[PDB]
Symmetry: C4
Subunit: 31 residues, 4 copies
């Protein structure tokens, strides 16, 4: 069951990169 949690963790990490990137876009835009 540990490998099921690890899929989610990685998926969560991916989503965090995407959000961090969306935020940098918006930032560069405004500036």
């Amino acid at each position: 069951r540990m490998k099921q949690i690890e899929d989610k963790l990685e998926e969560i990490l991916s989503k965090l990169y995407h959000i961090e990137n969306e935020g940098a876009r918006i930032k560069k835009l405004l500036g």
Copy 2:
């Protein structure tokens, strides 16, 4: 108590999807 973790994670992901959608609206509204 590994299921309780996987439940939390799943909740986390939903929040992240919502955050992601927020940034989409922010991008349209902006650029």
Copy 3:
């Protein structure tokens, strides 16, 4: 060790609410 993970999960949840709220502010602002 499960209760150490649970502190982090909750802390992560908290931070997600804060970010979701920061995003709604920005959104309301722009609009």
Copy 4:
């Protein structure tokens, strides 16, 4: 493999702190 989870979580949180700071700059730059 419960430590590997706690490591991931800690990584997640750092990302969330960074996202949080991004939204701070976005708010200043904007309002």
